[PDB]
Write a protein that binds this ligand. Structure first.
Ligand SMILES: *[C@@H]1O[C@H](CO)[C@@H](O[C@@H]2O[C@H](CO)[C@@H](O[C@@H]3O[C@H](CO[C@H]4O[C@H](CO[C@H]5O[C@H](CO)[C@@H](O)[C@H](O)[C@@H]5O)[C@@H](O)[C@H](O)[C@@H]4O)[C@@H](O)[C@H](O)[C@@H]3O)[C@H](O)[C@H]2NC(C)=O)[C@H](O)[C@H]1NC(C)=O
Ligand code: A1IG0
Ligand code: CA
Ligand code: ZN
Ligand code: ZN
Length: 779
């Protein structure tokens, strides 16, 4: 068989027929004439003045004979060089107010141009280096940066872009992985990447296909040059409407490859950036030549950035563990440890706060910051090392390969925590469905799959994006988000019980408007809970979990911090609105030698000696380890008031999270694995707070007319502070840094609590969704 008239065919052939498709050279074979017919290289990829009107030679990679338009095989710059047309980049931008597409185009095509290792800061280079990219950016919709997923590696991020899912959900949790159910390893080298068993979720090309939208093959054999890929995309675009794809992908391994070699700031980086820009120019000139340049939506997107990393900055596990022969380490900009064929508790202890400058931190995966969403997959090893930016971790010195000079082969790497600035990457949308010359706030790459679906008129598969949160990127929104329905209505108990009906072993001697600024959270699961009002705070008290799901209070800029009278030490009061049978009891805490308790509304911030008594109600009490109380006390005593001063008032919503199975979702009763001893009082795995104020800080938090400003955290409820290497010191030296490490989105808290916040504002729901997906990152 021949490839004549079949080069890079889209439709599937059977095993027996010889292949002519994008991947036929990858661990496979093509028709014998595939190279001759489909991989022409003669005379390169650019028309020159001397080639214009050349006699046609069928060996040429592309053609500059005048028949090339009718044959569909011009070089992308043919009309520029030979017919006096301008390069696309030399045309001033004009708003694409409507798609300018041929008849038979049911929708604008989507072309996804992904670049590997493209730091957000490279856009600083400007038209000097990247004129085509600069035009897309300045004339289209762009963000200052896009946040990748952790780990900030290629395959996890590419497949996240494709599926809208966290790595833990789509299954590509690294560039290297071991799956203990397969008992098999995944690597980038070799053929495992082609085995479908690794890839979960539903990538865009499958979503497209299943809904009758035709996809261009997203994948190319490594031997097929970039320029051939661009020409193929353009040729596919000229197919008749019954064969033409609506979505296309081009991927470049640059600037990542050069980034590793020369580091992100090396003078050698200019050249690769120029070459990427040339490739964009080829695509745009090609589209213009097809008159599709005001028809197609283009996304220019990176998977991650690039950090300065040299092998002199390597931590070795063998400086911490005497026996390293019994462990397998996935090394580099992150660490994952498992047994080679060993005790995890011993390993963690041996790796914890051992050296003053220690450039990694060990974790059990369930204790990693929840914002990373990196635990709920069997391919993620229990033991994880978060590596400091600019560093590597390795097993022993001999695993590092140095030149004779001592210098290493690499000066850049990536993979670090996705909060790190050097890991941030790029997003640009250009075309009729994107806004014109519009800057949008930074966002997470998990959100893009929904956008790409909307651009193609596809119903997205279930994913971790928040559908509607990027509506502000698009001219026209086919999807309009709706606020979810409240599932459980609250009770509003009055005074129902006598003091004397309580045997809890405890001893002691406008609310809405000012404390719930954005409406009551909605409970989106089936349960029984009560709204409890007080002078200084409001709560939604769970009769199932015997504590608030949420506690809401406002602290003005002028609010005063007080201390507890000695007599109120150990004070807990029964709540006459809540049944003894649905209350905590103090005996459980007395008998649980490991467990103490804290309060969601702090007595410290009571508005009067009288009101302070409300804070000591059993319904405001939550189980807290002594170690964690050090964190919580400092947050409540010092930080809340600091934030109120700095932000001109703050509204605080705090509560427990239960995630014993570390899936990032609210546990049901049955999934709770720890209770206060001898009681039905469940122990939170985490405690959250959402801190809201006016974006315009000249306005107080309770009188805000415009956009809101939020910061949130999900603190691990740990019986120790081993995570914080300075925790032997005053809380002023370490608690706030701990909190910043555990920063979160409101959305993260919503998943973990089954609550919906901000249901009553003066803001559009679309805008609220962006607020909920916002992540305040620090350091
Ligand atoms: C991020 O977004 C994902 C996708 O929406 C969320 O994951 C889903 O979580 C729900 C609720 O827990 C799951 O729903 C259940 O689905 C049952 C149907 O079976 C389907 O399960 C397979 C599992 O998916 C893969 O992903 C996990 C990830 O760890 C792998 O371990 C698995 O091996 C799979 O490869 C599906 O692929 C398949 O279609 C099955 O039909 C149903 O019977 C239950 O009643 C329940 O509804 C759902 O399975 C999850 N889907 C995916 C793709 O993971 C995830 O919670 C979100 N995370 C956060 C933090 O919000
Ligand atoms: C994952 N992947 C690709 N993804 C896209 C993509 C994703 C989203 C989107 F919106 C548009 C396109 C295109 S190709 C992919 C790749 C590319 C990897 C090449 N680069 C490297 O090897 C690389 C680069 C930099 C690195 N830095 C570093 O440390 O390591 C690096 C490596 N190659 C492949 C091969 C196979 C596949 C699978 C094929 C099967 N399908 S499925 C089951 O859906 O049919 C899944 C994907 N993807 N792939
Ligand atoms: Ca859970
Ligand atoms: Zn990459
Ligand atoms: Zn790389």
């Amino acid at each position: 068989g021949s490839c004549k008239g079949r080069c890079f065919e889209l439709q599937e052939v059977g095993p027996p027929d010889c292949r002519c498709d994008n991947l036929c050279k990858s661990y496979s074979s093509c028709c014998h004439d595939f190279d001759e017919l489909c991989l022409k290289t003669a005379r390169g990829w650019e028309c020159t003045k001397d080639r214009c009107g050349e006699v046609r030679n069928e060996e040429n990679a592309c053609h500059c004979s005048e028949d090339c338009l009718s044959r569909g095989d011009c070089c992308t710059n043919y009309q520029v060089v030979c017919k006096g047309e301008s390069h696309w980049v030399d045309d001033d931008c004009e708003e694409i107010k409507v798609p300018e597409c041929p008849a038979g185009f049911v929708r604008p095509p989507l072309i996804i141009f992904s670049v590997d290792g493209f730091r957000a800061s490279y856009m600083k280079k400007g038209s000097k280096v990247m004129p085509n990219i600069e035009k897309l950016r300045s004339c289209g919709t762009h963000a200052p940066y896009m946040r990748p997923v952790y780990p900030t590696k290629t395959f996890p991020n590419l497949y996240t872009l494709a599926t809208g899912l966290y790595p833990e959900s789509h299954g590509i949790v690294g560039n290297s992985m071991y799956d203990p159910v397969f008992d098999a390893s995944f690597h980038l080298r070799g053929r495992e990447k082609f085995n479908h068993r690794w890839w979960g979720g539903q990538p865009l090309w499958i979503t497209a296909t299943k809904q009758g939208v035709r996809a261009g093959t997203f994948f190319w054999s490594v031997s097929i040059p970039h320029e051939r890929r661009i020409l193929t995309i353009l040729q596919w675009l000229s197919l008749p409407d019954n064969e033409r794809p609506s979505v296309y992908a081009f991927y470049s391994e640059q600037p990542d490859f050069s980034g590793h070699k020369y580091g992100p700031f090396g003078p050698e980086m200019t050249n690769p950036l120029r070459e990427i820009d040339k490739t964009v120019g080829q695509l745009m000139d090609g589209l213009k030549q097809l008159r599709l340049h005001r028809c197609v939506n283009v996304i220019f997107v990176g998977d991650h950035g690039m950090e300065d990393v040299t092998c002199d900055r390597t931590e070795f596990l063998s400086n911490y563990l005497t026996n390293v022969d019994d462990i397998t380490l996935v090394p580099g900009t992150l660490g994952r440890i498992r047994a080679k064929s060993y005790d995890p508790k011993t390993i963690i202890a041996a790796l914890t706060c051992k050296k003053p400058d220690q450039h990694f931190k060990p974790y059990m995966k369930q204790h990693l910051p929840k914002r990373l969403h990196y635990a709920n997959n069997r391919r993620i090893e229990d033991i994880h090392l978060l590596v400091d930016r600019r560093w590597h971790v390795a097993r022993k010195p001999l695993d590092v390969y140095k030149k004779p000079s001592g210098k290493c082969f690499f000066q850049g790497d990536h993979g670090f925590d996705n909060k790190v600035n050097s890991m941030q990457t790029v997003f640009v949308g250009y075309g009729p469905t994107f806004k014109y010359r519009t800057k949008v706030p930074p966002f997470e790459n998990i959100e893009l799959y929904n956008v790409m679906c909307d651009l193609l008129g596809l119903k997205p598969a279930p994913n971790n994006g928040t559908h509607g949160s990027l509506n502000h990127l698009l001219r026209t929104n086919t999807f309009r988000p709706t606020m979810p329905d409240e599932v459980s209505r609250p009770n509003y108990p009055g005074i129902m019980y006598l003091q004397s009906e309580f045997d809890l072993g405890c001893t002691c001697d406008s609310t809405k408007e000012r404390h719930l600024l954005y409406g009551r959270p909605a409970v989106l699961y089936r349960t029984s809970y009560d709204i409890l009002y007080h002078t200084d705070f409001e709560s939604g008290y769970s009769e199932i979990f015997l504590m608030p799901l949420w506690t809401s209070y406002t602290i003005s800029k002028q609010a005063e911090v007080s201390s507890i009278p000695e007599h109120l030490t150990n004070c807990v009061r029964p709540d006459v609105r809540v049944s003894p049978g649905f209350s905590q009891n103090c005996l459980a805490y007395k008998n649980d030698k490991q467990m103490s308790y804290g309060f969601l509304f702090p007595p410290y911030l009571s508005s009067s000696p009288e009101a302070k008594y409300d804070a000591f109600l059993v319904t405001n009490m939550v189980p807290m380890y002594p170690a964690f109380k050090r964190v919580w006390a400092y947050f409540q005593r010092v930080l809340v008031k600091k934030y109120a001063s700095e932000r001109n008032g703050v509204n605080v919503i705090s509560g427990p999270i239960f995630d014993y199975n570390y899936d990032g979702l609210r546990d049901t009763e049955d999934e709770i694995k720890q209770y206060v001893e001898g009681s039905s009082i469940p122990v939170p795995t985490h405690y959250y707070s959402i801190i809201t104020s006016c974006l315009d800080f000249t306005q107080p938090a309770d009188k805000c007319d415009g956009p809101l400003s939020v910061s949130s955290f999900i603190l691990p409820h740990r019986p120790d502070n081993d995570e914080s290497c300075n925790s032997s010191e005053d809380e002023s030296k370490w608690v706030e840094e701990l909190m910043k490490m555990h920063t979160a989105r409101v959305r993260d808290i919503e998943h973990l609590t089954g609550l919906d916040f901000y249901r009553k504002t003066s803001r559009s729901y679309s805008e609220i969704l962006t607020l909920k997906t916002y992540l305040h990152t620090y350091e």
